[PDB]
Structure 1
Amino acid sequence: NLPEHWTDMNHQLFCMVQLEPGQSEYNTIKDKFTRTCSSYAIEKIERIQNAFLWQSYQVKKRQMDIKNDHKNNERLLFHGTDADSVPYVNQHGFNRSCNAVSYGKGTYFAVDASYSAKDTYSKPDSNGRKHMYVVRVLTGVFTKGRAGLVTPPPKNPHNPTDLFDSVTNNTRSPKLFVVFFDNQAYPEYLITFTA
């Protein structure tokens, strides 16, 4: 069940598709980035078409939608990473086993591209090229994180196995989310940019 906006992959399961500047899709993703990173220079935006990662993610989304009894479990967030991690993320997505982990040992996603645009995350390569993903994240029901978490806390100590879906720095006004399971995040776009 591959999304309508994907382009044909000639019976293959993985493609990075460079977006056409000035078309609706490129404009939408560029605007999400320029909301907070208007001082940067965008080289390109690529759509990540990874059928396997999409499949596993959509299964987790369906499960979380059932568990939480609503379809408000997904957020579009940003993730800055170094060039050497990009091939791994494109093919395998986010891996907590691979910076600070102040809110738990998971994968960190920013509400604002400006946070992910920090050199500590989107490490500039030899040429100053920086890499940021636009990510579909199953944040679901979240709570405040803390150092040393390996999974989200339980929603009630009385049922230790019924967990929050993610944690954040601040429940009232979140700026970051941490997820602790594979296939809770789908890397949808890769932005290549410079300061």
Structure 2
Amino acid sequence: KKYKLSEIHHLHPEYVRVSEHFKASMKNFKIEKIKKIENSELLDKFTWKKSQMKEEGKLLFYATSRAYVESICSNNFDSFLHETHENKYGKGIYFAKDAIYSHKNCPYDAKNVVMFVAQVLVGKFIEGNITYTSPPPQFDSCVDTRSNPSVFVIFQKDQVYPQYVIEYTED
């Protein structure tokens, strides 16, 4: 097993911060649990890539089925296996600035949905294009818009570290 998941108590400061970030857009919802992911092999790849890119992680959202938790936590997000978003901005993994975007676009029954939070290295971004299977040269990600970027399309696993899994329900 490549990873460990650990529940964070709801009064721990790390839970509070993750919850505030989620609730910034997820108004009508309560958090049932937050677990932190540790996977040293994924973390080491991400740390190296961050240094290479000259970038800092940003926490972005990714809604999926509970069925994929073990796979993502051990092997990272995979465009082919995982991605449900329509190809609007390129054939990569679609991360959201706002949790509600990932929530409302997820195709799974609410009883199956979990919200990942991932550290993502976005680097230099450009508007995406449906014909892109990688960003243009000198860009590291694609977006919906450069002036209000709210979806980030990532084409390499080492730009991502799965960090938290959030279980939530309507409230």
Q: Same fold (TM over 0.5)?
A: yes
Instruction: Give the drift of 1:123.
Output: 2.2
Task: For structure 1, list consecutive stretches of 5 or more residues without a partner in the other structure.
Answer: 1-11, 66-70, 155-162
Please state which structure has a larger fraction of its residues in helix.
2
State the partner residue of 1:160: none
The structure that has the greater radius of gyration is: 1
Contact 1:102/1:148, CA 8 A, preserved across alignment: no
Q: Determine the structure 1 residue equivalent to 2:87.
A: 101
1:141 match:
124
1:37 counterpart residue number: 26
Per the TM alignment, residue 129 of structure 1 is displaced from its structure 2 partner at its CA by 4.5
Question: Runs of 4 or more off by more than 4 Å in structure 1?
Answer: none
How many pairs were matched up? 167
Q: Distance in 2 between matches of 1:123 and 1:57?
A: 29
The CA RMSD measured in Å over matched residues stands at 1.6
Q: What is the CA-CA distance between 1:140 and the residue it aligns to? A: 0.5
Q: Using the alignment, how far apart are the partners of 1:187 and 1:25 within structure 2?
A: 15
Match of 1:124 among 109, 126, 151: 109
Q: Does 1:21 align with 2:4?
A: no
What's the offset of the Cα at 1:182? 1.6
Map residues 72-87 of structure 1 onto 2, 5 A cutoff. Answer: 73-87=56-70
* Identical positions, percent: 33
Query: Secondary structure of 1:38's partner?
Result: coil
Compute the TM-score of the two structures, normalised by the length of structure 1: 0.81
Normalized against structure 2, the TM-score is what?
0.92
Q: Gapped runs of 5+ residues in structure 2?
A: none
